[PDB]
Amino acid sequence: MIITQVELYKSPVKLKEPFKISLGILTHANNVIVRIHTASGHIGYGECSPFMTIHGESMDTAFIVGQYLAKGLIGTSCLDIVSNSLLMDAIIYGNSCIKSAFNIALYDLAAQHAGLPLYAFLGGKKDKIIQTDYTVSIDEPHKMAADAVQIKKNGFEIIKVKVGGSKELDVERIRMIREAAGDSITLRIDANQGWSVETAIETLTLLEPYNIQHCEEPVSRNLYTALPKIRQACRIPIMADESCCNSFDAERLIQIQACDSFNLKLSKSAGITNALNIIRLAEQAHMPVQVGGFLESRLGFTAAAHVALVSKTICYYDFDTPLMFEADPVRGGIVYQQRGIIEVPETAGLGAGYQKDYLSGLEKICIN
């Protein structure tokens, strides 16, 4: 099926509370939406959520680079996923975030053509429960404890805590949370490159007592070579996030035994195609994988959830941010049940789209 036109939308939706990580603060999910049209009249959807401090992209850059990509894809076959992923790479280096949106949409089309839901199209099956954590933004320790409580009250059984401040302050944060929410609720932490190699090790041995599940990206992504040293000095397992974007990154981290687990995100791997490679590597190395994301809407996370069913090595899930939107614009897609359990659509394709005339209100451009 030939690609006849692609539409791009700027989709800014405000968050209830601002989202806060060690790298900065965000008040909106400024996302970019991608719709691919085929001659047969099929439509594939894809979304991406640029994070300036991690992707190096913004909604503004995504919206423009996306147009470069669209131009190149017009006239090609939406089924040649590999050929087209390659075609985009030949057009512009990096820019994984926007690329992933196109890649996701292509798979949507492909699965639709096969008459399967994405997860089945990818060779996965529903043989496990998908359970999301919920994130406590990095703030003053009382505020953080309060949020942790509210989160447990809402029924969530896993808490993700954003750290990355000074050693003293992060420990106070974790304590005040364990103190105000209990020792039985499972919790995981994420520094977003916030610590130096030194502070990391000191803070991580100082936190072991509080029983934490794993720590994401303790130090700068440029310092990944110091990861093995930290892994061996610390009981808490460490999970590579920013340090693990594509499959080359994965292979390299494994080769030097840098971390215990990966955080896999479609935007970092420039789509599903390469995410699959990362998964295979993590399989061959018996490494648990957490699937996550950024501020994608339920549509984006619906893609993540499909991929999440592809392998038994995947077993942790960070699919929380859509719950922070002031308004949910998504039609279909994954549904959040109690305890933070997620159900994946069974209909053909991605199994999600956007609410009627939500898109018509958005700033858009149309390639061909």
Toward Mg ion, which CB reaches closer, 33 or 291? Answer: 291
Distance of CA 301 to the CA centre of its chain: 7
Beta carbon nearer to Mg ion, 122 or 295:
295
Cα(6)–Cα(42) distance, rounded to whole angstroms? 12
Distances (CA, A) of 208 to 156, 203, 228, 234, 261: 22, 9, 18, 8, 17
Contact call for residue 249 and Mg ion (CB under 5 A): no
Q: Report, in Å, the least distance between residue 30 CB and Mg ion.
A: 19
CA 188 to chain centre: 16
Q: Does 57 bind Mg ion (CB under 5 A)?
A: no
Q: Please report the beta strands in 39-137, taking only residues with DSSP state E, as ranges in sequence order.
A: 43-48, 130-131, 134-136
Report the nearest approach of Mg ion to the CB of residue 293 (Å).
Answer: 9
Among 80-88, 158-166, 236-244, 254-262, the segment contacting Mg ion (CB under 5 A) = 236-244
Residue 216 designated active-site: yes
Tokens of 35: 């719709």
Judged by beta carbon, residue 121 or residue 294, the one nearer Mg ion is 294
By C-alpha distance, which of 363, 349, 353 is closest to 329?
353
Q: How far is the CB of 188 from Mg ion (least distance, A)?
A: 10
Residue 208 counted as an annotated binding residue: no
For residue 60, indicate whether it is catalytic.
no
The verdict on whether residue 320 carries a ligand-binding annotation is yes
Q: Is 216 in the site for Mg ion (CB under 5 A)?
A: yes
Nearest to 362 by CA among 23, 12, 3, 6: 12
List the beta bridge partners of residue 2: 77
Our answer to whether residue 268 is catalytic in this structure is no
- Classify residue 286 by its DSSP letter: T
Residues ≥6 apart with Cβ < 8 Å to 86: none
Distance CA 223, CA 288 (A): 22
The answer to whether residue 241 forms part of the interface with Mg ion (CB under 5 A) is yes
- 183 in a labelled binding site: no
**Measured from the CB of residue 157, what is the shortest distance to Mg ion in angstroms?**
19
The interface region with Mg ion, picked from 2-10, 29-37, 55-63, 189-197 by CB under 5 A, is: 189-197
Residue 241 falls in the annotated catalytic set: yes
- Segment near Mg ion (CB under 5 A); pick from 3-11, 96-104, 190-198, 340-348: 190-198
Contact between 190 and Mg ion per CB under 5 A: yes
| Angle at 288 (CA atoms; ends 325, 52), nearest 5 degrees | 40
Catalytic residue among 241, 242, 249, 296: 241
> Of the candidates 123, 78, 75, which has an alpha carbon nearest to the alpha carbon of residue 102?
78
Instruction: Compare residues 189 and 350 and give the one whose CB is closer to Mg ion.
Output: 189
Q: Provide the 3-class DSSP secondary structure of residue 113.
A: helix
The whole-angstrom separation of Cα 42 and Cα 36 is: 8
Contacts of Mg ion in 349-368 (CB under 5 A): none
CB of residue 54 to Mg ion, shortest distance in Å: 9
- CA nearest to 45, candidates 100, 119, 123: 100
CA-based nearest residue to 242, from 93, 51, 66, 92: 51
The active-site residue, picked from 216, 242, 249, 296, is 216
**Which is nearer to Mg ion, 9 or 51 (by Cβ)?**
51
299 to 358, contacts with Mg ion by CB under 5 A?
none
From 162, 249, 268, 296, the catalytic residue: 162
Minimum gap (Å) between residue 263 Cβ and Mg ion? 5
Question: Under the criterion CB under 5 A, does residue 296 sit at the interface with Mg ion?
Answer: no
Is 126 a known ligand-binding residue?
A: no
**Site for Mg ion contains 170 (CB under 5 A):** no
For Mg ion, the closer CB: 8 or 239:
239
> Are the CB atoms for 310 and 123 separated by under 8 Å?
yes
Backbone angles phi, psi at 347, to 5 degrees: -80, 165
Q: Say whether 229 is catalytic.
A: no
Paired strand residues for 36: 6, 44
CB of 278 closer than 8 Å to CB of 254: no
Query: Binding-site residues for substrate, please?
Result: 135, 160-162, 265, 318-320
- List the binding residues: 135, 160-162, 190, 216, 241, 265, 318-320
Q: Residues annotated in the binding site for Mg(2+), as ranges?
A: 190, 216, 241
Residues that bind Mg ion (CB under 5 A): 190, 216, 241
**Residues marked as catalytic:** 162, 190, 216, 241, 265
